[PDB]
Amino acid sequence: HHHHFNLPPGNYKKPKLLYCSNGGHFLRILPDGTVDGTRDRSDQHIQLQLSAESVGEVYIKSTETGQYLAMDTDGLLYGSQTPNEECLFLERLEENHYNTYISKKHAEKNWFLGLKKNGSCKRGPRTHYGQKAILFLPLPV
């Protein structure tokens, strides 16, 4: 392992909203495959169904579109039509409270899922432990 194994409480029974502490945005996966954040709780593209691969491993899928959250070779997030290696994230507890999502594929590089205060997604290499951008709160929908 390149990372710790403190896991967050909770399960994957119901879909969730992934609320980013940084700018107060909900993670959004647009039908066009684009990824960002919105403060509009009413958005239809913020509903996500998480599931587990191995313990601590998850898929993050748009309920509206069926698209899987993924991070490309260049660290850019995108919506994938099919589940692939770029779609697996290491879900962990952080600061004894939040959830962090590390790219499994790019784990050794410490590339995280993250949102800027302006609601735009962060590129892998620009993320790092210790930022507010990587902190998420899963909220029920």
Assess contact for 3 and 90: CB atoms under 8 A.
yes
Declared resolution, Å: 1.8
Instruction: Outline where DSSP puts E strands in 24-120.
Output: 25-29, 35-38, 48-52, 57-62, 68-71, 77-80, 89-94, 98-103
CB proximity list for 85: less than 8 A, separation 6 or greater: 104, 105
In angstroms, what is the C-alpha Rg of the chain? 13
Beta-ladder partners of 115: 121
Method: X-ray
Tell me the pairing of strands 68-71 and 77-80: antiparallel
Q: Residue 41's closest CA among 23, 64, 30, 25?
A: 25
Beta-ladder partners of 79: 69
- What token pair was written down for 77? 């997030």
Query: In angstroms, rounded to a whole number, what is the distance separating the alpha carbons of residues 99 and 131?
Result: 12
Q: How far is CA 39 from CA 9, 12, 56, 69, 108, in A?
A: 25, 23, 28, 19, 32
Assess contact for 79 and 34: CB atoms under 8 A.
yes
Question: Is 22 among the annotated ligand-binding positions?
Answer: yes
Which own/partner contact pairs does 60-68 have at CB distance under 8 Å and 24+ positions apart? 60/18, 60/27, 60/87, 60/89, 60/101, 60/113, 62/29, 63/15, 64/31, 65/29, 65/31, 67/29, 67/31, 67/33
130 φ/ψ angles, rounded to the nearest 5 degrees: 100, -10
Assess contact for 70 and 79: CB atoms under 8 A.
yes
Query: In angstroms, rounded to a whole number, what is the distance separating the alpha carbons of residues 114 and 103?
Result: 11
Give the chain's domains with CATH numbers.
1-141 (2.80.10.50)
